[PDB]
Design a protein around this ligand. Structure first.
Ligand SMILES: Nc1ncnc2c1ncn2[C@@H]1O[C@H](COP(=O)(O)OP(=O)(O)O)[C@@H](O)[C@H]1O
Ligand SMILES: Nc1ncnc2c1ncn2[C@@H]1O[C@H](COP(=O)(O)OP(=O)(O)O)[C@@H](O)[C@H]1O
Ligand SMILES: [Ca+2]
Ligand SMILES: [Ca+2]
Lengths: 68, 375, 116, 375
């Protein structure tokens, strides 16, 4: 009877940490997808900003020559 | 065994006394703390009554014993009886003289200064004890694992103690003393049983409650859901045919009394559940001390063997408290003797000399010698 | 380590056996002594895979490969279950008699290996 | 490695110590400078407390440590602790004896003459150091590029230094010493957080501020325009769930504290922004020296890694100053170890013999030998 309680308790303890872990893991997995999308989005914008400021570097240069 | 004085090991409480031989690991003789009179007249000549009856002698035959409780949290109604209670332990069973071996005792935190001296007076003056000491309950349960950073909660029949002793002891208040353990649980059940008619009146059957309690009674996980379960007669109605002769179906009575632990409102006090007092001892200390406290919480005391005592802690602690570290409570399986395990150590330590009291040391600094120097 | 470069027990074995029978340790007495090591070798296999069973408290010691712990008690011919429940787990009650052993105290691997 | 005495490389500050093996390029062991007591009572027997805790040992477990700061700009409240701080570095990690290899240290400009001798006394008298030296922070960060004409601004946790060291050192005043770096930033945030309710009181969590700071906090480009941006909750509200368990949305708190750098008026002083002090060091020198100074401005110190620290300089310097040369500030990417890079050099130089101090040289000219001959 006592052995049953010991194991029965372990079941409640195992079930508790399982549903809690899976619950947060699922939430985390879904969050990663959102963060990953944001990473891809920000990276894309950074690429557009990088190629733009570079275009100004060659633009400000040619204008400096014409001014001289 | 023979060579070297060899010191004994003891741990007296306000309900159950723990004492054995010397150099042992666990208590060898655990007699109950009871001493009453024969309100009745003993047969008066079928022995000159006296002996209020004690030890396995009294517990075996309560019937005709008006069990008189001498030690009630702090105040000892009478010391005269305690003298003949200790005259039984060392001799009748251990068969060894204290006028030969040292002695170790436990200290109930925040106990009147006059008491620690009254006891020592009995030893030094009469039982001639050149060497002894009185250590602090919880701290002993500590030094017996493998780390110097854990919070301890030690209690049994005396009073509850929330002692966050890990790296050191005593700073602002942190520690707590609550008169609500063992004897308090035995006293509360009889009051609540009166609702069903059952009324264990005298103090003799009062003990039977405690005996029956530690066999089936358990703690409510959630009183709300368990109340609706009462409709069924399987998990509730429990069988326990009185050794006398009358079954007591302790169904909703088992998980009713323990609720008082989490709800001290049922015993006329403002004290919150044991999970609030946990915060009360954590919020006081530094900020960068918490993350590791949750990772280690020592729970000592045989009182913490009630089914449904540990699993509840994880539910209430994780609620109103920081939740990004490892919440972990160390509840030693046999946590009742955790103090006894640590006791056998102090009695064998050599550094102990730096702490203990010598015969002459008691006369030089007077009676206060003990708690006037140590803590 | 297993094999030693300097020692050749395969040949040295014949020197020990010559000492076994010559004195007065017949194979009967030998087997008797080996029944002790035979058990130990059946008990020695009892290893553990750090069991973090306890939700919080203290990591216990689990033995899935029970045949090692079973063979351990087979030689002793004792209850495989009770043995593990009465050794790896400490117990005491007491009251003039001499206690009823059953209560449980799972402990860390170090103390478990220490007791082993 | 083996042959030749082989000298070590070190760089002690008032917050973080940088030290490694010998002949290296970068620090191998950078332990924090902390040493407190157990105001609490250590377990007192669960080790004879002492060790205020230090190194990764103390930083790992602040909780029960009353972090006592020994070195506060110039004055060292107590030297006794410093002795056992250096007894850990050379041995516990480096596993090499200073009674065998030389030693190199850094010099905090304008430090009491009595201090430079007190330190050397610890080496020559006890740690037997026949050869050592103490060089000047900024000048080391210099000799490591490819020109003999650049102005340097080196600082970290100690005090700010605007040293226009390029062709030479020391002439009228130019150089500046300002007690406003590292530790000052960690102390100011907790005060300003009180406006929102958050109050990191004790000195333990005070360090947590510094830890959190170097992960998200940044400097305001223009506090005026950024204030109106507060209306939005995207660039402001930053996420940082306390490892304990309570999020702190550091939005307008990130770019608020750094404003003090440019506005010392918020810390009770008449000192102007770091772009005025720049003029203060340029206007003093000759007239035909400026055009090339603007073309090269060295900015060393890991403190200059806060997002929005370099781009602001071009805005304020070009404002109230000559504007017909190449305004250019060299802010080394990893400019924290710029001193360590130069340190490994001096320790390997041979001309170093012309500068360093020999055992006998300390006794012939007395203790002042060091800063009585060199500069
Ligand atoms: N197996 C058990 N399960 C639950 N409670 C128990 C068990 N054995 C003893 N107890 C209880 O433990 C208490 C005595 O514990 P103890 O540590 O001796 O207390 P104290 O030292 O405060 O007198 C009593 O309330 C008793 O009913
Ligand atoms: N990655 C980082 N970004 C910004 N600040 C940093 C970074 N790493 C360290 N710091 C900061 O640099 C300072 C320590 O730099 P350091 O050069 O060691 O100073 P000091 O030598 O004056 O003690 C601390 O204020 C710390 O928070
Ligand atoms: Ca107790
Ligand atoms: Ca510095």
């Amino acid at each position: 009877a006592r052995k049953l309680v010991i194991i029965e308790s372990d079941l409640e303890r195992a079930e508790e940490r399982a549903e809690l872990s899976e619950g947060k893991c699922a939430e985390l997995e879904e969050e990663l997808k959102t963060v990953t999308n944001n990473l891809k989005s920000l990276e894309a914008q950074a690429e557009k900003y990088s190629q733009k400021e570079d275009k100004y570097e060659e633009e400000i240069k040619v204008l400096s020559d014409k001014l001289k | 065994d023979e060579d070297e004085t060899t010191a004994l090991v003891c741990d007296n409480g306000s309900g159950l006394v723990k004492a054995g031989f010397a150099g042992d690991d666990a208590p060898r003789a655990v007699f109950p703390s009871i001493v009453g009179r024969p309100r009745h007249q003993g047969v008066m000549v079928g022995m000159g009554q006296k002996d209020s009856y004690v030890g396995d002698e009294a517990q075996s035959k309560r019937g005709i014993l008006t069990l008189k409780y001498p030690i009630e949290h702090g105040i000892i109604t009478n010391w005269d009886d305690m003298e003949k209670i200790w005259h039984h332990t060392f001799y009748n069973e251990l068969r060894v003289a204290p006028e030969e071996h040292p002695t170790l005792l436990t200290e109930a935190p925040l106990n009147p200064k006059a008491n620690r001296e009254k006891m020592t007076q009995i030893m030094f003056e009469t039982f001639n004890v050149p060497a002894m000491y009185v250590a602090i309950q919880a701290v002993l349960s500590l030094y017996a694992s493998g780390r110097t950073t854990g919070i301890v909660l030690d209690s049994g029949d005396g009073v509850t103690h929330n002692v966050p002793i890990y790296e050191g002891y005593a700073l602002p208040h942190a520690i707590m003393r609550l008169d609500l353990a063992g004897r308090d649980l035995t006293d509360y059940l009889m009051k609540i049983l009166t609702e069903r008619g059952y009324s264990f009146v005298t103090t003799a059957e009062r003990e039977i409650v405690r005996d029956i309690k530690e066999k089936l009674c358990y703690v409510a996980l959630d009183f709300e859901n368990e109340m609706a379960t009462a409709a069924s007669s399987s998990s509730l109605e429990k069988s326990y045919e009185l050794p006398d002769g009358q079954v007591i179906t302790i169904g909703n009575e088992r998980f009713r009394c323990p609720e008082t632990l989490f709800q001290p409102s049922f015993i006329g006090m403002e004290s919150a559940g044991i999970h609030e007092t946990t915060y009360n001892s954590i919020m006081k200390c530094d900020i960068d001390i918490r993350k590791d406290l949750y990772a280690n919480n020592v729970m000592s005391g045989g009182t913490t063997m009630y089914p449904g005592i540990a699993d509840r802690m994880q539910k209430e602690i994780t609620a109103l408290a920081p939740s990004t570290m490892k919440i972990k409570i160390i509840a030693p399986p046999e946590r009742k003797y955790s103090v006894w395990i640590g006791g056998s150590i102090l009695a064998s330590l050599s550094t102990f000399q730096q702490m203990w009291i010598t015969k002459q040391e008691y006369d030089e600094a007077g009676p206060s010698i003990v708690h006037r120097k140590c803590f | 380590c297993f094999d030693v470069s300097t020692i050749d027990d395969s040949g040295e074995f014949k020197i020990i056996v010559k000492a076994m029978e010559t004195l007065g340790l017949k194979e009967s007495d030998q087997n008797s002594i080996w029944r002790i090591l035979a058990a130990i070798l059946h008990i020695g296999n009892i290893t553990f895979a750090e069991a973090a069973e306890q939700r919080t408290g203290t990591t216990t010691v689990k033995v899935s490969d029970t045949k090692s712990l079973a063979a351990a008690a087979s030689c002793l011919k004792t209850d495989q279950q009770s043995l593990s429940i009465a050794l790896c787990y400490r117990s005491i009650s007491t009251g003039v008699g001499k206690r009823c052993e059953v209560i449980s105290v799972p402990m860390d691997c170090n103390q478990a290996a220490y007791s082993r």
